[PDB]
């Protein structure tokens, strides 16, 4: 995960817009 910045970038917005489906352990090592 070197250029994941492009992947997480969209997730940071999509997760903030929709906000749903997110396990307590499946949150990027907390």
């Amino acid at each position: 995960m070197k250029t994941i910045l492009r992947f997480v970038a969209g997730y940071d917005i999509a997760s903030h817009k929709k906000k749903t489906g997110g396990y307590p352990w499946e949150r990027g090592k907390a």
Side-chain angles (χ1 to χ4, degrees):
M1 48 261 249
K2 250 213 109 191
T3 188
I4 193 172
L5 78 90
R6 73 93 99 162
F7 172 59
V8 178
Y11 199 111
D12 203 329
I13 302 128
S15 180
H16 182 210
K17 233 146 232 263
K18 275 291 201 193
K19 196 202 233 177
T20 170
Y23 274 128
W25 49 257
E26 216 167 38
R27 286 262 196 76
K29 305 130 91 102

